Amino acid sequence: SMGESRVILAFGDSLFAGYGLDKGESYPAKLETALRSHGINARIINAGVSGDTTAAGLQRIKFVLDSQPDKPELAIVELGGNDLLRGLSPAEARQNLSGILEELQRRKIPILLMGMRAPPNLGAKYQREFDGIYPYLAEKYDAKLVPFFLEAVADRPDLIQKAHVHPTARGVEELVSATSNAVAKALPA
């Protein structure tokens, strides 16, 4: 094909950085290769930072854009998972994401928003509030939306790394039952 590559900014967290994976296995790297089959030669800027909250992304969006030799032709924004993990305010996550999308819109950079979903352990009130920020933002900022970015691994624990183990309340009881004998024996009489 003719011409310079199309520049796409992948602005997100561990899901873009490729946490736990080898060189070239991250979502941005594999997406770059897959777009060839759509007639697109892309250069995807991997601006994934593991652990980034919506606030962290807001704090760096201008610097990341100002650091680019070539202005992005599309920005893919994938943030909010770490706010969820931390149980942070969904309202504040929506405010922080609004600031990121406002900067992209100021620069006339098209947006694709990757929708995040809350798991049930946060409870229905939190989960409904969190989940609704993404459609709200996509309509407000005239952004395209992938409603559930992780949908294709939702029912596939074989496609997810064994990483953090946070026992549930019942899991804690299981651990206590297995280890209390050891603790009692270690405590001097």
Residue numbers in the entry: 0 to 188
The study reports:
According to sequence alignment, the catalytic triad of CrmE10 consisted of Ser29, Asp178, and His181, and it was composed of Ser13, Asp162, and His165 in AlnE4. In mutants AlinE4-S13A, AlinE4-D162A, and AlinE4-H165A, catalytic activities toward p-NP esters were almost abolished. However, the function of the Asp residue was barely investigated. Although the mutant AlinE4-D162A did not show significant variation compared with wild-type AlinE4, the B-factor of this loop was lower than wild-type AlinE4. In addition, one key residue (Asp162 in AlinE4/Asp178 in CrmE10) was found to be able to stabilize the conformation of both esterases and the metal ion Cd2+ reduced enzymatic activity by blocking proton transfer and substrate binding.
Here, we reported the enzymatic characterizations and crystal structures of marine bacterial esterases CrmE10 and AlinE4. The results showed that both CrmE10 and AlinE4 belong to the SGNH-hydrolase superfamily and the bacterial lipolytic enzyme GDSL family. The SGNH-hydrolase family, a superfamily that includes the bacterial lipolytic enzyme GDSL family, consists of enzymes possessing four strictly conserved residues, Ser, Gly, Asn, and His, in four conserved blocks, I, II, III, and V, respectively. Among these four residues, Ser and His serve as catalytic residues, and Ser, Gly, and Asn serve as oxyanion hole residues.
